[model samples]
Target: SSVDQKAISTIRLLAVDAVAAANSGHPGAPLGLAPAAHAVFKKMRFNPKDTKWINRDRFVLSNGHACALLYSMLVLYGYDLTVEDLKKFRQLGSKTPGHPENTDVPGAEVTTGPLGQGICNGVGIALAQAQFAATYNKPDFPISDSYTYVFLGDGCLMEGVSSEASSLAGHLQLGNLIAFWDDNKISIDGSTEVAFTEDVIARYKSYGWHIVEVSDADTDITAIAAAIDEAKKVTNKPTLVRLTTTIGFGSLAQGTHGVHGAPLKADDIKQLKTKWGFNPEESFAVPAEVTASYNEHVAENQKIQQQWNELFAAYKQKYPELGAELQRRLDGKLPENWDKALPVYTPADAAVATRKLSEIVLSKIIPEVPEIIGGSADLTPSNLTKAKGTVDFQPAATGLGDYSGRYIRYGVREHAMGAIMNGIAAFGANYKNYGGTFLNFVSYAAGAVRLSALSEFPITWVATHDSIGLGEDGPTHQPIETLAHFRATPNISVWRPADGNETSAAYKSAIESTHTPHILALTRQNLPQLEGSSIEKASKGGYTLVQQDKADIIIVATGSEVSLAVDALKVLEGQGIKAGVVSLPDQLTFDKQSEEYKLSVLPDGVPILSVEVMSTFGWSKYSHQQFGLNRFGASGKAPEIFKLFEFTPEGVAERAAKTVAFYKGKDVVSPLRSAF
Candidate 1:
């Protein structure tokens, strides 16, 4: 009891002073959740010396605003961090960044400032463990299996995305995922009862998750231990154990709203420490006995790592091939010819929906690249993401495509899907993670997509049914305004490829992208392939598809509408007028191209007409007259919708004819301005 009290009080005082000294940070949760963190970190199976150790269990603080809590604990436990860094909290160039950036701090596992993202990311982490273990773990060696423990409060639970990921975790029975809910009955807004009136426990039970409750904030150790034990016993099913905690344990603002987001006064720290029987004069203080107790656990982890390394060596001696494969995955190395099988089509091949082409790419490329992982948000059938032999990444079992499957069925949770993809990408720089959904669903996940750009993670967003041509799915499924939304975001490459060649190029840009993320906006309808299509040419961002020596006008097109522009050229040719066609696949990439190169593609003294089956928000910069849909589309087939919106060849030709006439008359075109 004395040992536990010393360690717990150490956590409390560390937060109190660190926040007071920095004159910033929220101390209430760190003060209240001290015992919980003390209990978990003391027992967590991890080698502090090898923080990046592959087998190390992960700890995610979903309530990232309370990073003051995590920083305090890491320092007390002596994990390559110090108390002085705590004093630099929220300061520029501080290791302790404002919202727990994984890149900023070594021990921080994931960048988790937005609520509920960490919870969903935990699902991906647990899934990763199960998958790696199943794929490479021999009878004698467990190559990659580790628990992903998460801590969240009422605020994390209130966010809707958590519901999306948590339900899937429970359904898949992710036993390796164990979460401790800080059931303080209080949030930043005052009380959970104010808005979160639903039965949290009952809700989890309905989702097939095991639930545990600890009534008293103090002396909840038995409940915590029991809950963890029960969770480990669960060979299937994720567990969420609710542990009650006061806002502040021994501070003057204990159990109140005032102390939640503010720094505790210096006097308050002294009085609080003395109240908890701690040395008020001591800062970041802890008894040697407490240190010795934690040292024992750390030593155990050290021994465990050594034993695991030895076990793996033994396994290598027996199964050299499997051992090598395991090592390659662990080392994050790509196999030879991993992308050699990436699908490619010819001009002779009949046109197919881009989503179908994407599936073919997945089937051909995924087998060679083991790190290639993806999931659709409950629209696998529509997105056409799941390959024939691919299995679902679930929580239930270690069998093929179960919890260990590379293809994840994200259960209609678009927001969580976006957040989880960032987590998978953030898990390591070497990882290449992607997710799929109907293009419209991206709006639900824009917040997380913003994080992808902010974090500079190369996560691929596969949004199919790019326009109003989704037929019976109607305007609701169509992404009329979606393309423009992403086009405006900085550092996100939005690619609307016209043919198989451009599609392949999109994949190349997506995988090779070191910093910029990608959104491949694909069509449900087929678009014909143009002559002279090449990966190099498409990667140039925009290229001349056809040449007319002394062209009359320039026509720009993308996606399904590109064919219309090609067909419209013949209409002009009949009238002894020559026209050139350009395929603008990626606007963001085109922007990066040299101004001369861009100008050459658009031409001086030549009239331009842009043809896309969506909004003309960013198209203005590239064209003189944009032919596109402005309002929501009517429910009908592609032909009907095209004709309805006047997207027909005749319609495009009319706009082109008028614009070309204006050019022939030497009329000045207005400088392009963005619709957004």
Candidate 2:
């Protein structure tokens, strides 16, 4: 009994001391969650030395502000974390920040603190393990049978993204996903009764999740462990265990909002420490007996890993091909000659929509890159993302494709799809995941997309209906500001392909980008295969399509509008204006090119006019004069809308002539200046 009490006391003391020393973190959650965290860590199967062990259980702290609790477990469990690491909590350049980052911390599975993202990421991990187990596991040897566990606070549940992810998790019947709710009634603003009084158990039950309740979390360590054990037995539903606890269990301000974020006062902390059987003067205390107990637990975890390894070695002898494939996937390597599957296009091809081009690429790429799993947010037909002969990832009892399916039908849940994509990507380096939606609707998934960039998950998004050229659906379904918005995000490349060749190039670059997220903005309108377009050139993000010996003007365009500029080039020539056209498909990638290559695409002396059917906010970095719509589009046919916005060949030519005439006396300076 004293061992358990000392372990729990050590967890609380470390968390409080870390927050108190940092003077800038929330300590209430960690203090309240010590017993639950300790109980779960004791029961979860993991080898601390090998943090990335494939079969190890996953733990996500959705309320990432309580990372002190997580870091303490890492230190005690013999992870790379040290007591000095805990002392540097919230300091500049420290591994611990105000929130948890997956890359920053050794054991953090997903970058959280964006309240609902971690739980959804946990859902993704569970789904992947389930799918992998179904694909490879035999009756005698189970390959991936690990569970994904998550810890959430009241704030995590209040976010709508969590509800969306939870609904899908229930629909999938992911029994390997277990979540613990730290139902402390105190939020930063005060008691949850002020606003959040909805029945959580009834809500989860309505979503088809199995529910377990622990009336007291402070001293109910066995109940917490028992609930997790029971959760594993129910193989048809996700489990959500609600554990009630005070906000700051032993502090004078326990159960009050004052302790939610602020550090406990020196006197209050001293009194709390004394009450918890610790020296009033001691800080960051870890009893030797508790450390020895953790050493025993670490030995047991290593034994678990040894047992799995022994089983895998025997399994390898029986099934060498499958075993080798799994091992290669774990190393993030593709099979031999995967790039040979990329399709080549020429002028002989018919005028095709970029979405259709993407469909062709997917059909060819899927067979070669089996790790590339894709789905759409209920826009499969429009997004054209379903690869030929791929099965849907559905439950076996549903009479659909089983867990080995490569395609997912992510039923109209864009936000969940985005967050879940992060999970799939973060599950292991072996998985390459993509999701699709209309370019206009990507704004709905911004919360998750931002995290994808933040966490460096290699994900691709099929953003179709890229411009007003999508037609008939009017401004509601057309994207105007989406390109500029996503282009401004760090580590996110926005690719707008001009033709079949450029579409292929976008996929090539997106696949090769291992640490970045990408969006392939495709056209619903058909675009011709340009005469001078080359995949090798377009892969540089921008390239000269039409060159003139003595060019007076340069026209830069992307996606469907590149064809408009090509036509405008001829029209301008007819008017005796010598102009060359540049097909700039991806702005971010083009920005990475050297100055010589960039200047070669857009010559220094020429006046440049940029054309696209979207907002011109970010094009100022490349063009002297912009030809784009700044206001919202009207409800009309696409051609009419183009005419209204002056986005036609004549309109583009007229603007170019005006731009050339206006800048006659002024010295031309390239807009590509060195960045801030």
Q: Give all candidates' CA lDDT scores.
A: 0.80, 0.88
Instruction: Give the winner by TM-score.
Output: 2
lDDT of 2: 0.88
lDDT tens digits, residues 70-178, model 2?
9988888878888888899999999877899987998999999988888999989988887788877998998788999999999989988899889988988899999
Best by lDDT: 2
**How much is the lDDT of residue 357 in candidate 2?**
91
In terms of lDDT, the poorest run of 10 residues in model 2 is 378-387
What would the per-residue lDDT of candidate 1 be over residues 1-676, giving only the tens digit for each residue? Answer: 4888878887778777777777887888887788788777865788778877778888999988788889877776667777889878888899887688875776887778788888887887777677777767766567666788899988889899999888887877778889988887777788777888889999999998888787765557766777778888886878888888888878777888778888877788889888777788877676778778777888898999998899888888888987776677567566665655666667888888888777777777777667778878857565565666667776444453564577887777899888888767755525677888888889899878887887677889888888887877787777778889888888899988888888888888887676778999887887776676777788988888887768777889887877788888888888777889989999999889987787768766678889998889988789888888888877787788888888887787788888877766675432332345
TM-scores of all predicted structures: 0.90, 0.97
What is the overall TM-score of model 2 with all chains considered together? 0.97
